[PDB]
Amino acid sequence: NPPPPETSNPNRQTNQLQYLLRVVLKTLWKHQFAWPFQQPVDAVKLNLPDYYKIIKTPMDMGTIKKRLENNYYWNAQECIQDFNTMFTNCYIYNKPGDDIVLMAEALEKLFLQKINELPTE
Numbered sequence: 001n002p003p004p005p006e007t008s009n010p011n012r013q014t015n016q017l018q019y020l021l022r023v024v025l026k027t028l029w030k031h032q033f034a035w036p037f038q039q040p041v042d043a044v045k046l047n048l049p050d051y052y053k054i055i056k057t058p059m060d061m062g063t064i065k066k067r068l069e070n071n072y073y074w075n076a077q078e079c080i081q082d083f084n085t086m087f088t089n090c091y092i093y094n095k096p097g098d099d100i101v102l103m104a105e106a107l108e109k110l111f112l113q114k115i116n117e118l119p120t121e
């Protein structure tokens with residue numbers, strides 16, 4: 001595998017960012033379908049031939065959770081895009097009828113529901 005993505009930013013929208021960690025991520029983390037997305041993809045263990053040749057911006061909730069905890073993000077938009085990157089990576093690598101895709105979509109729908117609760121900008 002390549003190394004996992006960075007969790008620290010080498011350099012106030014903090015309400016939404018706090019909520020992204022405490023409610024959004026935690027709610028997805030606890031969902032039944034969370035396991036494939038709780039850590040960087042280990043393409044050997046999970047036997048995902050060519051995953052890192054196809055997916056150039058790998059992303060996972062383990063990474064996003066640490067970025068939230070390290071106060072890594074520029075802004076809440078940047079975090080929201082890591083979530084979307086994770087989902088869309090799954091839609092790019094896998095066939096649209098696969099279990100893994102159905103799992104991502106369900107998490108994505110839940111994510112959109114929780115994003116609707118975000119505190120104001």
Ligand SMILES: CCCCc1c(C)nc2nc(SCc3nc4c(c(=O)[nH]c(=O)n4CCCC)n3CC)nn2c1C
Nearest residue numbers: 035036037039040041042043045046048090093094100
């Ligand atoms: C035994 C505890 C293992 C935890 C762990 C570790 C250490 N590394 C991992 N790497 C991964 S990759 C999960 C995954 N499986 C996929 C995919 C994927 O995109 N496409 C797939 O077809 N699969 C495999 C589906 C067959 C089970 N992903 C990433 C969304 N999972 N994973 C787990 C659960």
